[PDB]
Amino acid sequence: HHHMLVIWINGDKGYNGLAQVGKKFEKDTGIKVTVEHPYKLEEKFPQVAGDGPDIIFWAHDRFGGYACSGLLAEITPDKAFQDKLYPFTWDAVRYNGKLIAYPIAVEALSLIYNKDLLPNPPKTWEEIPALDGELKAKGKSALMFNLQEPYFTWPLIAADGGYAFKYENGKYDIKDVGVDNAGAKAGLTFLVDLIKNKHMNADTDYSIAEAAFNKGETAMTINGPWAWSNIDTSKVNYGVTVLPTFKGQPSKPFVGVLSAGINAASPNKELAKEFLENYLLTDEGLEAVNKDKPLGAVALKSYEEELAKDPRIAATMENAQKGEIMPNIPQMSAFWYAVRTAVINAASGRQTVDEALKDAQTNAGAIVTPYTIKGESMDPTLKDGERVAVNIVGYKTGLEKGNVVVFHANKNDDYVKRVIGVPGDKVEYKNDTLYVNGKKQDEPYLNYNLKHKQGDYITGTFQVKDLPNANPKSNVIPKGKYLVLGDNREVSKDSRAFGLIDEDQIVGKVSFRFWSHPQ
């Protein structure tokens, strides 16, 4: 808890080097420093942040989501300190006007190649098929890299025109997503073609690709500076160079800035600040980490003037220049998840490229907001206190019968009920039997309440035409109106009492996990 620091950093980074900086800090101050590298730490952090590390290391892209959620302290570096780091690194860690992390290092992917298998790396993605042909002849392959994380395939996807969210007039437009445009389709198609033609395997992941390259089995890989240490150990004669072009266009990697945030709930914020500013972000601190696993082009000017000398760093920055700084907006999480699914599905054959990217386009922009359920009127479908995810609906967008919707009841109160009828639907109840457009409709979500009722009927007979805001001449639901009922029908105050609601009151659809799925 109190007289110590717990730090999270990813498994692929120099965590032993960071721990040595932690030992120096313990020597000087008596404050113990524990460095952990949990699997999927970037997803776990919100879970635990309630506990959780005092300091969390990740690429800057995740931090706006963390900050929006109130999980991060605003950092308070003075001018003198701010001047020690490149201005553009500070830009990566600013969110809603405030600094929310300490930038550490600029990361971009490069093409890494074995000079003994391949003295001249290919200028173009288009050469790789032939090249693989030649290399297969001697029991080798041309190219292996991690296909499970879209970070690694994004440079190819963006080459001919893909993008995440358009940045225009000083802000990102969350509605302008570049995932299923022509450029993205061509790139992902070429990737799938490589797999179809057995020049790559769809199951290749980080460790498989790294082992292959470091054991001399593949001529090329795609990875960041962190990977160079293991290659040094392997004695592969390697080079780090500019990524090939695709359709004449440079590959465009998403550039990250490894950043260090301070938990908003930490009682050691002052120690965290001391550690980061005066131990880590020094020539000596960065060197210790860098010596373990290279950081990339560091944020600290004094040390970067040394590392910029390295040709491999010159390559890293060259690839960066053709790419783009990741957005840090909260929507990034949804983007990456959408694009991970799309690549995996297109590569495995589960979907075509058009299908995968059409779904990804939709999912990357779909805004999701957490809500807490209050009351028992949706029981047992939703319970009092239940945390749910709510898919925000665009102003005049596709609501459907069965959807459970959050809506504004008044200026202060949001309600949640199930859509039983949409505009145009003719609806009534005869006892507990639902009739929509002349057909009885089963309501399996009421099965429990139907079989544990206090009364004769849980919903009871009624007709739309008798309800507030209805067409009193018709059971057909008016234009822009919706019939909503609570699943706990016996106790629910819903359209039976307050009538049809308006389309403009609806905020989103509640997402449900279905208990069953394929194995």
């Binding site: 907001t369 209050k374 009127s377 939703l382 009841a409 949640v416 609570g486």
Partner: peptide, 6 residues
């Protein structure tokens, strides 16, 4: 925390 009344 956004709350929704069931």
């Amino acid at each position: 925390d956004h709350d929704a009344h069931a």
